[PDB]
Write an enzyme that holds these catalytic residues in place. Structure first.
Site, mmCIF file in Angstrom:
data_model
loop_
_atom_site.group_PDB
_atom_site.id
_atom_site.type_symbol
_atom_site.label_atom_id
_atom_site.label_comp_id
_atom_site.label_asym_id
_atom_site.label_seq_id
_atom_site.Cartn_x
_atom_site.Cartn_y
_atom_site.Cartn_z
ATOM 1 N N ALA A 98 0.811 -1.329 -0.084
ATOM 2 C CA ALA A 98 0.044 0.116 0.071
ATOM 3 C C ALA A 98 0.781 1.143 -0.245
ATOM 4 O O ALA A 98 1.555 1.422 0.800
ATOM 5 C CB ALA A 98 -0.863 0.085 1.292
ATOM 6 N N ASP A 99 0.760 2.026 -0.967
ATOM 7 C CA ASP A 99 1.467 3.482 -1.129
ATOM 8 C C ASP A 99 0.936 4.435 -0.264
ATOM 9 O O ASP A 99 0.057 4.301 0.457
ATOM 10 C CB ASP A 99 1.546 3.774 -2.569
ATOM 11 C CG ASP A 99 0.194 4.109 -3.198
ATOM 12 O OD1 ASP A 99 -0.768 4.202 -2.607
ATOM 13 O OD2 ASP A 99 0.177 4.500 -4.451
ATOM 14 N N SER A 100 1.263 5.512 -0.627
ATOM 15 C CA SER A 100 1.016 6.855 0.545
ATOM 16 C C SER A 100 -0.613 6.848 0.272
ATOM 17 O O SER A 100 -1.479 6.912 1.416
ATOM 18 C CB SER A 100 1.511 8.039 -0.097
ATOM 19 O OG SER A 100 1.182 8.177 -1.388
ATOM 20 N N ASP A 153 -2.852 4.675 -0.644
ATOM 21 C CA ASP A 153 -3.534 3.344 0.011
ATOM 22 C C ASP A 153 -3.484 3.503 1.544
ATOM 23 O O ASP A 153 -4.593 3.254 2.094
ATOM 24 C CB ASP A 153 -2.916 2.245 -0.425
ATOM 25 C CG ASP A 153 -3.143 1.953 -2.002
ATOM 26 O OD1 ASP A 153 -4.495 1.798 -2.334
ATOM 27 O OD2 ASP A 153 -2.267 2.092 -2.716
ATOM 28 N N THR A 154 -2.488 3.702 2.012
ATOM 29 C CA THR A 154 -2.474 4.043 3.530
ATOM 30 C C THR A 154 -3.374 5.047 4.090
ATOM 31 O O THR A 154 -3.777 4.928 5.139
ATOM 32 C CB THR A 154 -1.057 4.112 4.110
ATOM 33 O OG1 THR A 154 0.008 3.475 3.110
ATOM 34 C CG2 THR A 154 -0.833 3.776 5.533
#
Lengths: 50, 50, 72, 49
Positions: C33-35, C37-38
């Site tokens: 999970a990228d920025s 997604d987080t």
């Protein structure tokens, strides 16, 4: 940011074409000179197969 | 004047609440599509990042 | 128990199943999970529990276990 | 804006508190000034006698 944004789409299109091209070949390219030397190897294979 | 801004804060809070439901519900579907797309389409064919 | 919320929502937000997440791992890099997604994950956690988490506290959830540590 | 509003409310309550003290002081001063006006009239009366 404006400069980078104006520049981005062209670089992205170029990268997609480059990735497709080198993946189509067995060898992976990294620089202009590298592409040229690959040209030369391609010519040698032409003139042997012929 | 400030109590009306508090009441403005309440109105803004419910707006935020609406937006938040939108976001979570959207991701629920993104999950499924990116599950199915992994049949090599996403690699470069559908993901036209230009 | 109540943790079934988190361990459910996490998966529903990251595409992994309930047991896939390991407490030792980190969302930012070990879950994919990228920025964005987080941010979506933390904000979905906020929605589920009908509460609020400021930016400073919200940034301290990079590890799997933290999602319950602030909850319980 | 939420935290600002909370902080502005705390400041507002503090300014309201000090004005409540001055309002009380004004009523005490009004009482003292009523007595002061009476004192002037009492002195004017004594001068005439």
């Amino acid at each position: 940011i404006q400069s980078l944004t104006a520049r981005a789409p062209v670089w992205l299109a170029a990268q997609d074409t480059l990735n497709q091209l080198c993946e189509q070949s067995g060898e992976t390219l990294a620089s202009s000179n590298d592409v040229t030397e690959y040209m030369q190897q391609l010519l040698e294979r032409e003139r042997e197969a012929t | 004047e400030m109590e009306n801004v508090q009441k403005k804060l309440r109105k803004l809070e419910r707006d935020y609440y609406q937006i938040r439901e939108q976001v979570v519900s959207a991701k629920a579907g993104w999950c499924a599509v990116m599950r199915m797309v992994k049949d090599n389409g996403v690699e470069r064919r559908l993901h036209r990042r230009e | 128990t109540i943790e079934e919320r988190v361990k459910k929502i996490i998966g529903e937000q990251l595409g992994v199943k309930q047991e896939e997440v390991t407490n030792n791992a980190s969302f930012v890099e070990d879950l994919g999970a990228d920025s964005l997604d987080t941010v979506e994950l933390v904000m979905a956690l906020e929605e589920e529990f009908d509460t609020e988490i400021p930016d400073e506290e919200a940034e301290k959830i990079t590890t799997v276990q933290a999602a319950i540590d602030y909850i319980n | 804006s939420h935290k600002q509003l909370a902080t502005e409310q705390y400041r507002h309550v503090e300014m309201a508190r000090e004005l409540a003290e001055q309002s009380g002081a004004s009523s005490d001063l009004e009482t003292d000034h009523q007595a002061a006006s009476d004192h002037l009239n009492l002195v004017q009366t004594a001068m005439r006698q």
